Design a protein around this ligand. Structure first.
Ligand SMILES: CC(=O)N[C@H]1/C(=N/OC(=O)Nc2ccccc2)O[C@H](CO)[C@@H](O)[C@@H]1O
Length: 504
């Protein structure tokens, strides 16, 4: 038998017909079609009144999306007696084998029925439903001249990995609450279920801490290249969390420590050995900054920050960073990370950290390693301690240029085009681990505008999202590539300023 790898498409990028991404466990199509008309309602039915009420909110979110493009006014009904032309969302009789996020979605001529185990699974199923309707459905304004049809079809689905996330760096360049909500919204449509916020680094501090107000008054006032920066009040952070919760997306806030701390060090002189504030940094160097690992003021600071963040962040996880502490000795890093893990745990939070944080003698088996290095020795500690691992290999570093000539992006992990972002498995990063899942990281050294985010995340994130959701045995670049071509108008319709990758 003959085999080959993909080259660039001759003559440039290529960028009744459903376009499901990520690929579901099974999808069959039969004869006939359902027609969504102006008289459609969404019916919801759970196993008890509380569950029905949650399904009602989900139904309303779906109706809002459908109404924007159809111009209809579909409303939602608490009833288990759907009428012909209805969409029906239910958790009654869900297939347990499909888990919390799984669903069956069966479309007949008279009715769409989505059956899940939990409301979360109805929400994930709804993302598929939107992809079964014609391109045009994802428009934010009314589309005319398109019959809103769904082929008679049968889908069963569930994720391969529990953790399927996106990180946005808002420290290097700041993005508004609206901009952050948009990226959360867009990612949710591809079944991303985790959003990691990199809230602080050398060039800026982005979260209001009432007990240390100069973190904002001084530490938020810049960014890479010297713009004005910005920050989130605690009320704004809560709003982001709430918006994410409506999409069954867990928000994990990161305060990076003991390295990548210049913004805090520039805000408070007492955090520095010489008692003087550091100058703010607007360059892109990494590795040089450190908290004082043997000063109690350091641990008081971390505790105040953790206390306030814990109060407003319902996720059971807090990310404490731990990458590139090149100005911290191995012994002091071990000690430091153990102390801050104890603080986090006392405030009811489990710690996530970049490698090599798993090597801290103060880590517990409840701690989580974010494995970005992906070397043979990375996560040896995590594995021995029974710590879950989230992988972020080169293929998940979405800030990497697509090609040598990309006008934005970095290249320290090589170039990562749409194909590279697809052709990998989490076990390529680490073997012998309990892999919790995958996280796409969008660092923002070189990204200033919303269009820059769109360009780098789309289509790269679609590739990563399928690696997280679809089983390895069912992943195939030739298949995905052709599906991606088909999906292109949907990206256009959503207003995503994607890169038309020539490998697609
Ligand atoms: C965990 C992580 O990725 N840390 C830093 C980081 N790690 O940086 C490198 O080590 N870059 C580098 C390594 C060797 C040679 C040249 C650059 O990469 C990101 C950008 O992709 C930065 O935004 C992060 O702060």
């Amino acid at each position: 038998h003959h085999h080959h790898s993909s080259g660039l498409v001759p003559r440039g990028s290529h960028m009744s017909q459903p376009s499901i991404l990520p690929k579901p466990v099974s999808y069959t199509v039969g004869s006939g079609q359902f027609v969504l008309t102006k008289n459609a309602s969404i019916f919801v039915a759970g196993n008890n009144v509380g569950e029905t009420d949650e399904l009602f909110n989900i139904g309303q979110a779906l109706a809002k999306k459908l109404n924007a493009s159809t111009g209809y006014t579909i409303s939602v009904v608490k009833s288990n007696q759907p009428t012909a032309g209805s969409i029906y969302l239910t958790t009654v009789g869900g297939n347990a084998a499909l888990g919390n996020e799984g669903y069956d979605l069966i479309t007949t001529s008279n009715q769409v029925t989505l059956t899940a185990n939990k409301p979360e699974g109805v929400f994930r199923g709804n993302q598929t439903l939107l992809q079964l309707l014609p391109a045009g459905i994802e428009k934010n304004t009314v589309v005319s001249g398109v019959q809103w049809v769904i082929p008679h079809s049968n889908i069963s689905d569930k994720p391969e990995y529990e953790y399927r996330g996106l990180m946005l760096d808002v420290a290097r360049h700041f993005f508004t609450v609206d901009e952050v909500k948009r990226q959360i919204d867009l990612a949710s449509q591809y079944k991303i279920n985790k959003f990691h916020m990199h809230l602080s680094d050398d060039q800026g501090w982005r979260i209001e801490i009432k007990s240390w107000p100069d973190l904002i008054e001084i530490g938020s006032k810049g960014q890479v290249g010297g713009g004005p920066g910005g920050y989130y009040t605690q009320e704004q952070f809560k709003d982001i969390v709430s918006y994410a919760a409506e999409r069954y997306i867990e928000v994990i806030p990161e305060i990076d420590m003991p390295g990548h701390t210049n913004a805090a060090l520039a805000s408070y002189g007492e955090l520095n050995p010489d008692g003087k504030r550091k100058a703010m940094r607007t360059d892109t160097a990494v590795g040089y900054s450190t908290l004082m690992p043997r000063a109690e003021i350091t641990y008081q600071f971390v505790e105040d920050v953790i206390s306030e963040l814990a109060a407003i962040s319902p996720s059971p996880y807090i990310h404490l960073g731990g990458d590139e502490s090149n100005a911290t000795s191995a012994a002091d890093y071990d000690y430091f990370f153990g102390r801050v893990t104890a603080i986090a745990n006392s405030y009811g939070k489990k710690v996530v950290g970049w490698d090599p944080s798993d090597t801290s003698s103060g880590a517990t088996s409840d701690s989580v390693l974010q494995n970005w290095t992906c070397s043979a020795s990375t996560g040896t500690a995590a594995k021995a301690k029974g710590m879950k691992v989230i992988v972020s290999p080169a293929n998940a570093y979405l800030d990497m240029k697509y090609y040598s000539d990309s006008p934005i992006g970095l290249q320290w992990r090589g170039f990562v085009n749409t194909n590279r972002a697809y052709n990998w498995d989490p076990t390529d990063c680490i073997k012998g681990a309990n892999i919790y899942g995958v996280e796409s990281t969008l660092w923002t050294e070189t990204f200033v505008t919303q269009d820059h985010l769109d360009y780098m995340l789309y289509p790269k994130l679609l590739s990563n999202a399928e690696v997280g959701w679809t089983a390895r045995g069912d992943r195939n670049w030739d298949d995905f590539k052709e599906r991606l071509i088909e999906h292109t108008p949907r990206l256009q319709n959503k207003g995503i300023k994607f890169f038309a990758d020539p490998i697609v």
